[PDB]
Design a protein around this ligand. Structure first.
Ligand SMILES: Nc1ncnc2c1ncn2[C@@H]1O[C@H](COP(=O)(O)OP(=O)(O)OP(O)(O)=S)[C@@H](O)[C@H]1O
Ligand SMILES: Nc1ncnc2c1ncn2[C@@H]1O[C@H](COP(=O)(O)OP(=O)(O)O)[C@@H](O)[C@H]1O
Ligand SMILES: [Mg+2]
Ligand SMILES: [Mg+2]
Ligand SMILES: [Zn+2]
Ligand SMILES: [Zn+2]
Ligand SMILES: [Zn+2]
Lengths: 386, 233, 14, 660, 619
DNA sequence: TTAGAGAATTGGAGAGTGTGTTTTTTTTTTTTTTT
DNA sequence: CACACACTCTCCAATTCTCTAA
């Protein structure tokens, strides 16, 4: 029935710290990391109340998605009484209230992060997963609430952002200067150009040579990274047997050979990429963790690096320096491509179709060519075979 | 010669003189009225002394200043655990070590209303914590009822500092933990005893009702007790 | 029938 | 649907005239100006809607489009006047200024007015202030310099060579000056169809956010007048009096002086000395306030019982009452929550018709200095000539004058004749002949006839417009008598016909506004002093003044001591002081109202201790108490007769009021 | 409409007017008239009025009038301000009404949290304390403008109290409205509102007593100017904030020490009051070349011109670094090059190239390493000092702490972002701790994926480590690798290694003692610290580039380094990687910045090669 | 003009409709990161 | 649930008013 317009590439980008009263009821482009996300609750679009005293029809008031519709005196009679909606002619729209939080990258070091609630209306729900980093364009409106006025003791209002568009910037933080809500979306001309250049003989060599253009040599590493980036086909025989369809790469070598730089490039290039390093990646943060929800007080399951990188790439720098009991947590998600969690009464099997690219470092810092591979690394066969 | 207000009057000095024995007993029994009349007598005696000795001074300045009396050493060191409820509104001497002290609590003394239709402002004195708001504008040319709105920041406030006194360890029975009582300090002596100090406090042991429900006027029948400090040593 | 130029010359104060 | 179509047409005209960033005249600009003029005229009087003006104010037409037209024409006019299609470039400003004066015309609402006009009056009075706000602040308000061009074009030619048509141009341009400066905030018309709740009106500030009381006061108007040179315009217009330029001009230069007092002219870090004095006074009153508050908190609980007659044990709280028994009795008095009902009551430009004594508009020192000489130059130029010009018109159409004419004329006359006398009193550089020309017999008899005619129609405002002039009549008679037969013909007709009018108003006007009561006390004070140099009899005129309602209306003024000034209390007290030994009629003064006001006077909460008002009053009250004691000691029944009003019986009337 | 006017109020307004317009205060200059012109230039609406200027005029009468009854006099001051600002230039007020904020500062006396008394309510204070918590910048209603639900009449300029006060009556005498209105958010005026929670300073707290806190309200331009931890000197009116729950609100209900009662709007419930400061001004008490030059005064420009045109500027800078340390010219030169840094280039593929220089001053326990670190942390801006002992729970890099959700605790390597992280006792911190900074020292980011939290944090810091050799005293019989517990991956990330030894020389100790005792008795630096800081800031704006011959010389020097570092039968380099080539580039850029030249000559590359070679020939 | 017979209006008690509570986060498991 | 509060709905006799009284 209706077509919405998603404005993209707003010039003036703010942060949840620089918003002021001058921005009220004006388009803003704040940037932050999603923290909470309610379910997609249907919301009243055109409320058509029926008078209880005398009338039976009230005007199709537009719900503003921020404040409750006020009826006050009825039109049929001035007398006031209870009112309720009509189920005959009523239309609903999706409603989700995501809670943006200032990104740890843009938060000043050591300071607490600010946060504003963001309303996602129809067609925008479920577009920003929790924990992802997004750029939200929308109207910066304010509504009055008595709770805040009572708490602060001043006639102070509560602000909220009615999102008009969302672009995710998680896993492509090096992709500034690009245009559009999706850097990886292609136009028809772009698709024709893809089909034209693919027919070229030696396109594979061009693609391989174009992986790390500012990194000399390492054609074997570039080939492996290109193969991992494109990936394979995930088979499923008769619905019973399932074959992994993603390629895992392990870069093992001496220091100063651009192993971490290649990983940073892959993070820049791949669609859904997550970077985790060494000891700074625990077992449950790599795959999945359960937590007691502070508001509803029950156990809920939240994904980690291997879920945020689903159908993408997960980059693990300094693979050999992670704890063994943290490194063994990616055994299932790297072969079966599914995280199985049965903690706190939550028995479920998440899906993580990741493609691990890990950079290691040989024992002693130098790769001893006179010894076999197993004697140069601390990794074992079950993780080396993946 | 120093321009001070408080007086560190001692209780035994009333027994020393002849005609002020009934005065001392009434001070122990009726501390509020006795202290008020003592303060008024102090002010009148000082202005009379200024008049008589011809020591030239601003009479208005002396009259404006509120002069206080601090009767200490009222009696034997009464125990906190032995505060039976017939000591209500009676002068009490207590000894203990202060646990903590709340920040300054402003209590309204003089209200300040404004006529929201003619900008007429008058101050209504507050007695016993009740607001006697004017029924209408004082100005006859306006005399609009219900046109008065309180201007909170233009009122006059006093200083109240509730202090949680604790029974001294050397006097508490060895079995049970020492008890505690709540002090009340007004207009002076505020921050005159930081936490950890040991003091001998003199004040009137008073009890007030507490509202069971904030919205309603229902009052609990337990009458939480405090003491109105008049001197701290 | 206002031109783009009129749009730039606000008439309503707000 | 009709209203939004009207809005559509206004917006269509707004984008048709043109805009900026120099303003550009669009195609058919004259046609759209004529269309707008015709629509506004049709909706103003023919239909009486007052909605087109609203739409114009909404599009900010007067600010965004109309003002830049005159601003852009000003530079062309200056270039053409200094260099040495002029008719087309001249006629364009005529319609713009005609529209401006039409929108700036004051709005009047009466009972005969329909609901639309009263409904939109409150929504358009703020826009009226907006117009004058943006006009005065528009780069020194140069639009008035363009306005005076719409008058100098016609007045340049010979007066005998005037035009039967161009004559209306002068009226139209002149009305703009009086209309812009008469713009004042209105009144919040509370909807009294139902009983108001436990809370009153929240905000009485009838000002839109773009309008501040700083940018709309008469100080801004006077500063704009000085900076726009229009002082010379107002002087030259009056310099060539020797008809249609009299009635508007009567209020063009009167509106900004309709309520401004002449005391602020003379002071009698310069502004900071009065600041220090006011701080001292407020410190004194705050010191008096704290004399009641307890030395300790309210909850100290000072309870007492007053052993009143009959061994009563009435309980009143408060440690303050323990200090003095009078404080305890006052706390007894004000403890009652029951109160009685006190009854109470501008249709013309607000001023003395509705302004209290403290409403002195703040003036810049330089602005005050300029205004001191502006009015003096006007008086030295054409004051009496302008008065004599309208003397002939005032003698005709007595019953054809709307109530606006009296309030806009009598106040002007009285204010300026009072200013001239006070200026002559403070400084001798001004001759009394500069105002002595107002003693003409015909003018005096006509103004007296108007004053007496206003009495029978219950037009109290029009009558108050007359007492303010009647005071200065006696004042000027005294001034021209002391400083000197021309004064006799003006001050001998109040023998028998006028004594009733002057001796009846004080007895009846006590139930009205404060200024109405203030007028009569000044009248009596002046009349008791003008005749003192010739005594038709001193003992006979005072006989009709010593009446109980007269004493009531004099003592009703004393109850406002929180706002009465030194002279206000001085006149009221001197009325009784001058009759203490000269008349010896103190028996009628024995009401408790005067004794309670005396108690308030000598109390520190009333009159100032450092001032020069409470000393002689205190001594005279000391003598008053001696007189009271002497008169009460000789009559036991007079102890309770002091409260009850006097009696009409024959023998007691001389037995009690005169003591045999 | 009859309204009585407090003549004292307009008198104060007029006196403020003359003070603002004709103060004319070391030649005569109308400072406040120029202040209003300054406001017109940039549209800012904060008038910083010094209190001394107000006190000297009017012999202190107006100053006392302000300082005693500020709360009641404020609207009159605003009106007087409007008068002057309109008179000088009406360029104020799609008209957008301008709300002004008079700021008073430099009060004669400064109070404190302990010295709060309720008898100072409605008066100007200068409260000073350490901020511990700041709320969000919420917009508070300032001048509401309601539209009634019927007859569409607009009630405007409704002044707001601490409550949500709304008009009670409609100006149009045909609208029935006593509690029904719809606020016009677009027409209403809002003000920035922040609530900071300050507390008593540490030195002002009596022993044993807990610190006393206060809630200070910040409005307007003074928002976000007081960060937590910073000791600020607030100044403004002190007010008391009632409990708006008791006053009654459209959306909440009263909730359950001495509360008064009896108000018409209250009924049977009581009202309690809380003291809260309302700050009007807060100050803490604890870039192209042309842009920097235009921000510098001409007198400083002269000093900078003398430096840049100098011939021996490089050696003078080296000798002027850490004057209180005797000898150690090489370490001084390395520290100087650290502050200048390199160029933080970013290639086309998105790969970021490091531009920061890392130094490691390894030396005997009696040497002057910590003196160098302390000088750097006390001189270089945005620098922190930390040890390897890992004092705080958060490590050198970052940590997550559960809140009784997860949040990031900033480590030492993050607080020094875009600065220098002076790490001390680099050997003490364990090998299981070294693996954390391998990325933060080369990729300059810290990546954390612990539990429900996942972020790639920024650490663009230069590390100046100071590690004691293994065994306490340096052993020259072994290479630098043997004397240090650091491994090859972390030893190759350090650009410069400086070895300083306390050789048992009878003469050297004499100069050392004479120097230390000489300082304690009173060092003459050719450039003072404040004088050198502006030169470093000016030089940092340079971005030197490599000339054509510079590239060839750099490649040849790198070839020589790798040839001389070859070890093993398979010719496997151990100490010299391509990181050393990038280190030569970084040092060349830093040296060229020292000479304030935009081109890198082969002399600079030769010097950088010498600097690297001297740190690896230690055998 | 005075003491006294007639109209005319509206505030202070009360009928009544709808409110507002009492009402709670301890202690005990389970997880997770550091220690 | 019901007792107490806040407040809309509703209502006669004491308080004000102006025509006919002395
Ligand atoms: N060349 C020097 N010039 C000036 N003072 C020096 C010099 N060498 C040593 N000192 C002094 O020697 C003392 C100790 O030096 P530090 O800088 O504290 O080194 P350090 O921290 O003690 O070394 P360790 O291994 O941590 S114990 C300080 O008071 C220095 O001022
Ligand atoms: N083959 C190469 N081409 C270009 N630069 C390289 C190459 N190998 C290493 N480098 C440089 O070495 C620097 C450090 O690489 P680094 O990310 O530390 O690799 P590793 O983590 O394996 O030691 C990078 O800035 C990179 O530019
Ligand atoms: Mg690496
Ligand atoms: Mg050290
Ligand atoms: Zn209905
Ligand atoms: Zn009033
Ligand atoms: Zn309305």
């Amino acid at each position: 029935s209706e077509i919405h317009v998603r404005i993209s590439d707003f010039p003036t980008i703010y942060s949840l710290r620089e918003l002021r009263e001058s921005n009220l009821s004006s388009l803003v482009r704040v940037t932050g990391v999603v923290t909470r996300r309610t379910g997609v609750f249907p919301q009243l679009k055109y409320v058509k109340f029926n008078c209880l005293k005398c009338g039976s029809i009230l005007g199709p008031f537009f719900q503003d998605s921020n404040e409750e519709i006020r009826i006050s005196f009825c039109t049929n009679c001035k007398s006031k009484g209870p009112f309720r909606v009509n189920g005959e002619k009523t239309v609903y729209r999706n409603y989700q209230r995501v809670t943006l939080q200032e990104a740890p990258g843009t938060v000043p070091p050591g300071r607490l992060p600010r946060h504003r609630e963001v309303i996602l209306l129809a067609d925008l729900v479920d577009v920003s997963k929790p924990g992802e980093e997004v750029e939200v364009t929308g109207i910066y409106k304010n509504n009055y609430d008595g709770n805040l006025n009572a708490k602060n003791g001043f006639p102070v209002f509560a602000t909220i952002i009615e999102a008009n568009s969302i672009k995710r910037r998680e896993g492509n933080t090096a992709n500034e200067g690009e245009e559009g809500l999706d850097v990886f979306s292609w136009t028809e001309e772009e698709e024709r150009e893809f089909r034209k250049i693919s027919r070229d003989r030696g396109i594979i060599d061009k693609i391989i040579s174009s992986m790390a253009p500012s990194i000399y040599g390492h054609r074997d590493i570039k080939t492996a990274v290109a193969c991992s980036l494109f990936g394979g086909v995930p088979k499923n025989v008769n619905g019973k047997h399932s074959i992994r369809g993603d390629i895992n790469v392990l870069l093992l070598g001496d220091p100063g050979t651009a192993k971490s730089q290649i990983l940073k490039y892959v993070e820049k290039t791949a669609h859904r990429a997550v970077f985790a390093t060494g000891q700074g990646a625990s077992a449950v943060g790599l795959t999945a963790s359960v937590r007691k929800d502070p508001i509803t007080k029950e156990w809920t399951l939240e994904g980690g690096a291997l879920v945020l990188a689903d159908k993408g790439v997960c980059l693990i720098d300094e693979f050999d320096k992670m704890n063994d009991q943290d490194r063994t947590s990616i055994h299932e998600a790297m072969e079966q491509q599914s995280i199985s969690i049965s903690k706190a009464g939550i028995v479920t099997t998440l899906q993580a179709r990741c493609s691990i690219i890990a950079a290691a470092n040989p024992n002693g810092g130098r790769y001893n060519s006179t010894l076999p591979l197993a004697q140069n690394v601390s990794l074992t066969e079950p993780i080396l075979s993946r | 010669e120093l321009g001070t207000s408080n007086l560190n009057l001692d209780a035994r000095n009333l027994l020393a003189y002849k005609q002020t024995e009934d005065l001392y007993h009434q001070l122990l029994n009726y501390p509020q009225e006795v202290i008020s009349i003592m303060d008024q007598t102090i002010k009148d005696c000082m202005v009379s002394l200024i008049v008589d000795n011809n020591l030239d001074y601003d009479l208005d300045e002396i009259e404006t200043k509120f002069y206080k009396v601090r009767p200490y050493n009222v009696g034997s060191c009464k125990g906190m655990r032995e505060l039976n409820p017939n000591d209500i509104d009676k002068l009490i001497n207590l000894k203990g070590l202060v646990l903590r002290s709340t920040p300054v609590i402003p209590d309204m003394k003089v209200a300040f209303f404004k006529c929201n239709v003619c900008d007429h402002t008058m101050a209504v004195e507050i007695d016993r914590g009740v607001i006697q708001e004017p029924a209408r504008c004082e100005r006859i040319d306006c005399n609009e009822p219900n046109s008065m709105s309180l201007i909170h920041n233009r009122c006059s406030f006093a200083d109240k500092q509730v202090i949680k006194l604790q029974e001294t360890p050397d006097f508490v029975p060895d079995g049970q933990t020492p008890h505690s009582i709540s002090l009340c300090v007004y207009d002076e002596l505020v921050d005159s005893c930081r936490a950890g100090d040991r003091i001998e406090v003199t004040g009137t042991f008073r009890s007030i009702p507490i509202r069971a429900n904030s919205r309603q006027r229902v009052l609990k029948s337990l009458y939480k007790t405090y003491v109105d400090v008049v001197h701290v040593k | 029938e206002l031109t783009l130029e009129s749009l730039s010359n606000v008439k309503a104060n707000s | 649907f009709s209203l939004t179509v009207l809005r559509a047409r206004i917006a269509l005209l707004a984008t048709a005239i043109g805009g900026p960033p120099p303003y550009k005249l669009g195609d058919d600009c004259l046609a759209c100006l004529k269309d707008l003029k015709r629509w506004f005229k049709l909706v103003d009087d023919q239909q009486k809607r007052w909605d087109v003006a609203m739409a114009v104010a909404e599009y900010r037409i007067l600010t965004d489009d109309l003002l830049p037209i005159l601003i852009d024409w000003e530079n062309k006019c200056s270039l053409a006047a200094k260099l040495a299609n002029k008719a087309y470039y001249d006629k364009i400003a005529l319609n713009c200024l005609q529209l401006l004066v039409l929108m700036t015309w004051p709005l009047i609402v009466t009972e005969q007015s329909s609901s639309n006009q009263i409904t939109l009056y409150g929504e358009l009075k703020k826009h009226q202030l907006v117009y004058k706000k943006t006009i005065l602040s528009m780069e020194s308000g140069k639009v008035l310099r363009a306005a005076i061009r719409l008058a100098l074009d016609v007045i340049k030619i010979d007066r005998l060579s005037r035009t039967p048509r161009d004559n209306m141009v002068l009226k139209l341009v002149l009305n703009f000056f009086r209309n812009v400066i008469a713009i004042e905030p209105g009144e919040f018309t509370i909807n009294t169809k139902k009983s108001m709740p436990k809370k009153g009106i929240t905000s009485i500030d009838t000002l839109p956010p773009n309008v501040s009381m700083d940018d709309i006061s008469l100080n801004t108007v006077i500063s704009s007048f000085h900076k726009n040179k229009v002082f010379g315009f107002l002087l030259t217009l009056t310099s060539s009096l020797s008809d249609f330029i009299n009635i508007p001009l009567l209020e063009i230069m009167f509106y900004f002086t309709k309520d401004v007092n002449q005391e602020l002219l003379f002071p009698r870090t310069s502004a900071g000395f009065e600041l220090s004095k006011l701080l001292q006074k407020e410190h004194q009153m705050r010191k008096n306030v704290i004399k009641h508050t307890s030395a300790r908190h309210s909850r100290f609980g000072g309870l007492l019982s007053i052993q009143t007659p009959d061994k009563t044990r009435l309980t009143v709280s408060g440690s303050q009452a323990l200090v003095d028994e009078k404080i305890a009795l006052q706390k007894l008095d004000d403890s009652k929550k029951w109160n009685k009902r006190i009854i109470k009551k501008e249709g013309l430009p607000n001023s003395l018709l509705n302004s209290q004594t403290g409403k002195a508009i703040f003036f810049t020192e330089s602005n005050g200095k300029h205004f001191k000489e502006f009015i003096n130059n006007f008086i030295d130029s054409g004051f009496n000539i302008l008065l004599h010009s309208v003397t002939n018109y005032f003698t005709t159409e007595q019953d054809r004058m709307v109530t606006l004419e009296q309030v806009e004329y009598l106040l002007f006359f009285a204010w300026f004749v009072k200013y001239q006398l006070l200026r002559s009193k403070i400084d001798n550089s001004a001759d009394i002949k500069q105002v002595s020309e107002a003693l003409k017999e015909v003018t005096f008899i006509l103004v007296s006839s108007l004053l007496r005619s206003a009495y029978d129609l219950k037009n109290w405002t029009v009558t108050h417009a007359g007492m303010i002039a009647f005071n200065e009549l006696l004042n000027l008679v005294s001034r021209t008598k002391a400083a000197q037969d021309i004064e006799f013909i003006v001050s001998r007709l109040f023998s028998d016909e006028r004594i009733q009018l002057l001796s009846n108003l004080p007895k009846i006007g006590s139930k009205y506004s404060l200024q109405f009561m203030k007028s009569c006390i000044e009248l009596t004070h002046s009349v008791l002093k003008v005749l003192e140099q010739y005594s038709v009899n001193f003992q006979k005129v005072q006989a009709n003044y010593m009446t109980e309602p007269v004493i009531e209306t004099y003592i009703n003024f004393l109850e406002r001591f929180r706002e009465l000034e030194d002279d206000s209390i001085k006149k009221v007290f001197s009325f009784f002081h001058r009759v203490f030994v000269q008349a010896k009629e103190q028996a009628l003064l024995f009401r408790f109202d005067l004794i309670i006001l005396l108690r308030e006077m000598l109390s520190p909460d009333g009159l100032d201790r450092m001032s020069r008002s409470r000393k002689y009053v205190s001594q005279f009250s000391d003598y008053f108490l001696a007189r009271l004691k002497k008169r009460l000691k000789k009559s036991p029944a007079w102890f309770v007769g002091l409260l009850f009003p006097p009696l009409h019986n024959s023998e007691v009337g001389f037995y009690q009021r005169y003591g045999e | 409409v009859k309204k009585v006017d407090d003549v004292t109020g307009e008198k104060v307004r007029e006196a403020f007017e003359q003070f603002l317009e004709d103060f004319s205060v070391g030649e005569v200059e109308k400072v406040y008239r120029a202040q209003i012109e300054f406001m017109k230039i940039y549209d800012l609406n904060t008038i910083y009025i010094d209190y001394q200027h107000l006190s000297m005029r009017e012999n202190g009468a107006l100053a006392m009038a302000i300082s005693e009854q500020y709360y009641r006099f404020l609207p009159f001051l605003q009106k007087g301000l409007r008068r002057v600002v309109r008179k000088y230039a009406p360029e104020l007020l799609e008209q957008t009404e301008r709300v002004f904020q008079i700021s008073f500062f430099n009060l004669p006396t400064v109070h404190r949290i302990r010295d709060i008394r309720s008898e100072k309510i409605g008066s100007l204070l200068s409260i000073s304390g350490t901020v511990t918590r700041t709320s969000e910048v919420r917009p508070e209603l300032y001048k509401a403008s309601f539209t009634c639900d019927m007859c569409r009449a607009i009630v405007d300029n409704v002044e707001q109290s601490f409550k949500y006060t709304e008009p009670t009556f409609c100006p149009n005498p045909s609208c029935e409205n006593r509690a029904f209105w719809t606020l016009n958010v677009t027409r209403s005026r809002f003000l920035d509102w922040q609530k900071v929670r300050i507390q008593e300073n540490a030195n002002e707290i009596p022993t044993g007593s807990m610190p006393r806190t206060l809630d200070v309200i910040l409005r307007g331009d003074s928002v976000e100017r007081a960060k937590p931890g910073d000791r600020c000197k607030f100044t403004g009116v002190e007010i008391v904030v009632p409990d708006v729950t008791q006053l009654g609100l459209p959306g909440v209900k009263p909730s359950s020490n001495s509360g008064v009662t009896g108000l018409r709007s209250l009924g049977v419930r009581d009202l309690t009051y809380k003291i809260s400061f309302l700050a009007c001004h807060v100050i803490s008490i604890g870039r192209d070349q042309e842009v920097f030059l235009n921000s510098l005064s001409s007198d400083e420009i002269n000093e900078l011109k003398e430096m840049v045109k100098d011939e021996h500027i490089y050696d003078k800078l080296v000798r002027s670094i850490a004057p209180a340390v005797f000898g150690h010219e090489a370490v001084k030169k390395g520290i100087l090059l650290q502050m200048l840094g390199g160029v933080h280039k970013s290639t086309v593929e998105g790969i970021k190239l490091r531009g920061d220089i890392n130094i490691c001053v390894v030396g005997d326990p009696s040497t002057s390493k910590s003196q160098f670190l302390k000088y750097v942390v006390g001189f270089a801006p945005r620098s922190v000092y930390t040890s390897g002992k890992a004092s705080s729970a958060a490590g050198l890099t970052a940590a997550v702490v559960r809140d009784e959700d997860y949040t990031i605790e900033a480590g030492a390597l993050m607080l020094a972002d875009n600065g220098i992280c002076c790490i001390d006792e680099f050997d003490k911190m364990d090998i299981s701790d070294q693996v954390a900074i391998h990325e933060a020292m080369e990729q300059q980011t810290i990546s954390i994926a612990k539990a429900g939290i996942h972020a790639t944090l920024n650490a663009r810091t230069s590390i100046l480590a100071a590690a004691n050799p293994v065994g306490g005293r340096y052993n020259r019989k072994l290479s630098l690798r043997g004397n240090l517990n650091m491994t090859a991956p972390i030893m190759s990330r350090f650009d410069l290694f400086f070895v300083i030894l306390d050789d048992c020389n009878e003469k050297i100790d004499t100069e050392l003692a004479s120097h230390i005792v000489d300082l304690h008795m009173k060092i003459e630096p050719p450039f003072s610290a404040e004088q050198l800081r502006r030169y470093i800031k000016y030089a940092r704006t340079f971005k030197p580039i490599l000339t054509k011959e510079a590239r060839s010389y750099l490649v040849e020097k790198y070839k020589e380094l790798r040839k001389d570092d070859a070890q093993g039968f398979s010719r496997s380099s151990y100490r010299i990687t391509v990181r050393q080539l990038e280190s030569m580039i970084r040092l060349s850029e830093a040296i060229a910045r020292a000479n304030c030249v935009d081109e890198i000559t082969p002399s600079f590359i030769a010097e950088a090669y010498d600097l690297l070679r001297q740190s690896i020939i230690r055998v």
